């Protein structure tokens, strides 16, 4: 199930740590879009947001 | 800039609302060519953007050749206005 | 970019004939209509109808198949091409399959078959062979 489409949000702020945490596995590794059921476009946007969040410290790089 | 493009189109339009025509396209192409020449002189190594510039130059030359073939007087007038050779 | 619409027309007929398609459509022209009517009155096609549009008109051809769905048109070939134009004098007019086929020829009297051309004793441009 594409969570992004279900929630019906078109913009992915890199500040919504609550939103991002459901797309990263334990240890902080990003999840495959096949695993998460999300689409390709949303996956790219999530990737950018998660990377930016990691840089700004909202999310951990490892562990 | 689309506003710059629109004002150029209005200036060189053969008549009202003539978006596409040899003169309009050539004028717009020339302004883009000049701006992109500045960009290349700034970034000598932007070879891909330079290829786009060369495509624009070739297209502009083809339009000029067609205009010269069709109406030489308009060709002379346009080169005078745009300062071309 | 298309460079020989007549050759493209012949190719469309050949491909549709190969797959035994019932009909085919082509952009229309005076030469194409001449060729189509020659085939019509020679019996190589079932019928020809013309559709009027805003661009250039459209010509529709109904392929003719005999009993057992046999193809009447064996094949078509473009003889005179933009790369190499072909012209034949009166005594040079060809016979396709010893007359079983036809050769569409354009002359001062218009687009006519080889039989008519050599009956009139005139040459021209050998547009195509059909058989």
């Amino acid at each position: 199930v594409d969570y992004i489409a279900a929630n019906h949000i078109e913009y992915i702020d890199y500040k919504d740590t609550e939103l991002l945490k459901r797309f990263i596995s334990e240890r902080g590794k990003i999840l495959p879009r096949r695993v998460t059921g999300t689409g390709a476009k949303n996956q790219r946007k999530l990737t950018i947001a998660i990377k930016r969040a990691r840089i700004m410290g909202l999310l951990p790089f490892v562990s | 800039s689309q506003e710059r493009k629109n004002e150029i189109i209005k200036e060189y339009a053969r008549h009202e609302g003539d978006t596409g025509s040899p003169e309009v396209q050539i004028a717009v192409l020339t302004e883009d060519i000049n701006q992109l020449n500045e960009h290349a002189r700034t970034h000598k190594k932007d070879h891909h953007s330079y290829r786009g510039l060369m495509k624009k130059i070739g297209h502009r030359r083809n339009l000029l050749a067609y205009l010269r073939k069709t109406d030489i007087q308009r060709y002379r007038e346009l080169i005078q206005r745009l300062g071309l050779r | 970019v298309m460079t020989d619409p007549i050759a493209d027309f012949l190719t469309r007929i050949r491909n549709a004939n190969m797959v035994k398609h019932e009909t085919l459509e082509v952009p229309a022209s005076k030469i194409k209509r001449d060729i189509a009517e020659i085939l019509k009155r020679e019996g190589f096609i079932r019928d020809v109808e013309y559709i009027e549009d805003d661009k250039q008109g459209v010509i529709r051809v109904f392929l003719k198949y005999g009993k057992n769905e046999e193809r009447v048109i064996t094949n078509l070939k473009r003889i005179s091409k933009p790369g190499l134009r072909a012209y034949v004098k009166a005594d040079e007019v060809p016979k396709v399959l010893n007359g079983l086929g036809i050769a569409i020829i354009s002359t001062s009297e218009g687009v006519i078959t080889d039989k008519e051309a050599r009956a009139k004793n005139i040459g021209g441009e050998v547009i195509a062979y059909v058989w």
């Binding site: - | - | 019996g43 009447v72 010893n98």
Partner: protein, 163 residues
């Protein structure tokens, strides 16, 4: 399909090829024979037979050729019209010839045409000379041949109007 029975068929051995299969001990020699069986009246066919012995291979080929008989249109002493037949590398061109010109062909094509009954024709093999492929190419051209009556009936015109 053509029924071999009721037809006075005669055969000619186009070629006998000594073919080998390599086996653990050594060679295993066999004979592959290509045969053309015809009626001298417009019916002809070709067959292939493999056997340890030449006579058996020829017999198998003749039986196969009878099963594969085909009929060829013929106008007078020659074929109706020019035709080029291709099978694999084989490529044969055949054109009608005037009366008395003979069968100007080579090897396998001579057998096919003579057996089919054609007497005056010109031919040229523009492809490979492999006997099996040239024979196959020849029959492809002969099948391509067409009859004036059938063509006229198909086109919906009289034979005179066609010609």
């Amino acid at each position: 399909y053509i029924d071999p029975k009721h037809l006075e068929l005669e055969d000619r051995v186009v070629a006998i090829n000594r073919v080998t299969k390599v086996v653990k001990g050594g060679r295993r020699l066999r004979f592959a024979a290509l045969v053309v069986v015809g009626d001298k009246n417009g019916h002809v066919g070709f067959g292939t037979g493999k056997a340890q012995e030449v006579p058996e291979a020829i017999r198998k080929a003749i039986e196969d050729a009878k099963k594969n008989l085909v009929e060829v249109p013929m106008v007078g002493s020659t074929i109706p019209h020019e035709v080029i037949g291709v099978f694999g590398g084989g490529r044969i061109l055949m054109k009608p010839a005037v009366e008395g010109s003979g069968v100007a062909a080579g090897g396998p094509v001579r057998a096919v045409l003579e057996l089919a009954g054609v007497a005056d024709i010109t031919s040229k093999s523009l492809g490979s000379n492999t006997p099996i492929n040239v024979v196959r190419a020849t029959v492809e051209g002969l099948k391509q041949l067409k009859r004036a009556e059938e063509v006229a009936a198909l086109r919906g015109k009289s034979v005179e109007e066609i010609i």
